[PDB]
Amino acid sequence: PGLFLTLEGLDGSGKTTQARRLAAFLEAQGRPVLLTREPGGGLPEVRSLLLTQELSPEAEYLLFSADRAEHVRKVILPGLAAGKVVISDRHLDSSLAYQGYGRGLPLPWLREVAREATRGLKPRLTFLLDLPPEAALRGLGLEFFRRVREGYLALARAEPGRFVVLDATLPEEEIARAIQAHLRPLL
């Protein structure tokens, strides 16, 4: 049947390390796992273009959406179909937090765009590594990042049965054990 898990948070929140540690945990249990990420899991050139390219919020979101649609169709759904636990480092919630709450696009339109792109797929659990922007390991520019951080927390409190919010400043090993604890009833 497979199981779709995601990790979310600011760049430097540790969600990339935790995604790796989660995959390793599953490997040690003998559970087939596929680790992937956005942007670029669908369309690698989208990732490379957006390193440098300045774009409107709409166009940025739509490029990210094209990547996500191809990611869903070619990577995630086929992995789930083989009964893998598929872990994505970032998924739709990243666009909602960054292009929505950060850059100001309205969530209902963002979700309508995503509806066909994601084909009704939803993460069973989403681990949000929360910390303030000043704690991310990787004045005025921080206002955006605080909108993003708050936007994530807004998403989480709207879906408390999907989000698990973790103190990203805790030791790496302890965050990983918290993740495992939340996940264990679902395997």
Add this chain to the structure above:
Amino acid sequence: PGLFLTLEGLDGSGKTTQARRLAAFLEAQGRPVLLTREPGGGLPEVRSLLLTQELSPEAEYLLFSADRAEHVRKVILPGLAAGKVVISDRHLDSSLAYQGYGRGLPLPWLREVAREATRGLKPRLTFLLDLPPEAAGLEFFRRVREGYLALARAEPGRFVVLDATLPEEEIARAIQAHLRPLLP
């Protein structure tokens, strides 16, 4: 106020020739003109991504939509704000015909994606160069060609359906004639 005109049709329909001829005609009337096109008028780099092998229909559309959003914001709306006649060689109708009728994506979704940030912008007129599909797989091209004609049937004041097999200069004169009333 400015004036937004588009041209549509299959590749090889003469849509591009007519867009260029129209720009030259409107300029000869002292009317300031901005000639532009999709894909690439918004995000030139989209052209590369669009060639991706076996791209899902959703991803293909969404790429077109990113370029189109940037095109609308940065090129088209500012051109119209300056009172120019803005002519786009392809616009949303291309995606509706190709990704909707051709690849089977639902038109309401395509339109809801497109609607954002456009301030209700629609072409005032859309000149459809109707080309038989074999002159462009063939099944796909038939759906796209007939898709365009369905769009035109649905909005009969906006679309001007032209037989693309006619001599280029006759097509140009028909386009000019439709435009007469929208000029002084």
